[PDB]
Amino acid sequence: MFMINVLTLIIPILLAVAFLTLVERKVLGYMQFRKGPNVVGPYGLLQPIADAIKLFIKEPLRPATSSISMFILAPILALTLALTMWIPLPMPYPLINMNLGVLFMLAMSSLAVYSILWSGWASNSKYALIGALRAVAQTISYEVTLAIILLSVLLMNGSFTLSTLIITQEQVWLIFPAWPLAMMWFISTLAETNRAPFDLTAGPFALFFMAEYANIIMMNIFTTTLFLGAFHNPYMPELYTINFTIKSLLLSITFLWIRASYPRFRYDQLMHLLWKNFLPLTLALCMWHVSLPILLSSIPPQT
């Protein structure tokens, strides 16, 4: 039954990513005055099926690379992170109940930084190396900030277990005891998934693309779990599954909708922005979330 759980968790991620591609293309289309893709079949679903299978058909550019085994080794790492990294995230009862999973989340994001660096090395000549090196720097610039904000938001929750989180977010959502901390966290999730307003400007582009959009859905699932969620009734958990999926959908739409309407940042403006604006304020929110529960006489019941 365990491998059946594995198949039911890791088979639908491909359907999730391809239907996310049609969702974001249609959402950008209605942000513009566009319909489409709607000519190809009913409302364009076999059109993402078709361009996925076309890009698998379409013949690769012959390397023209160096260290072919390393060119193998990088996107396999990115996609196996995207596969392994939905395990402790509770849709109502999670796959592996862990003592600690959020440090595991951040460490797997650091492994994604490794995969980006290895693809940038093994790809091509010097300019691709410089561009991917700046991309690795603007990805690594935020595992300081996002892990710091994670530490601050679950200092109000005691343990790393994430089921104590899904319990202790029953009364009010944790968006209310930390709104600026959560907003800076969401900016850092845009930085981890690396979309506009955070710039980018090879193969397999399908697997690079797959790892990125599964990373997006993963970060929005962890956003919905980390900050909110309604009451969990056992012996009817489909209610929590529906409400969880609805709020994760709405926040993914809001994520792409924030992408839809802003210019990209200058690179030195991005570094200047992160350090000299977020990092003293994250420290200040850390120290105030340290000094608060000793003043409310409420340290969390750390089991």
Binding site: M156, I167, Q171, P177, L296, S297, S298, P300, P301
Partner: protein, 68 residues
């Protein structure tokens, strides 16, 4: 007779104003709303934390009396 296209009877006004209504309120009201909702969340979180402290002490009583 003549059938050119002149403006027939004159056309009305066309605006060119920078008309920005400045939606929203003052920033002091925004700080008041933010601090108020934040402190509301703090009080509710405090109450729920100490309720679960009571239940956690009861679970400690369970593990104490269950042991010998």
């Amino acid at each position: 007779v003549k059938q050119d296209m002149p403006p027939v009877g004159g056309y009305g006004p066309i605006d060119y104003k920078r008309n920005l209504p400045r939606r929203g309120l003052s920033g002091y009201s925004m700080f008041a709303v933010g601090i108020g909702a934040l402190l509301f969340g703090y009080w509710s979180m405090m109450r729920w934390n100490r309720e679960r402290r009571r239940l956690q002490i009861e679970d400690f009583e369970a593990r104490i009396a269950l042991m010998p």
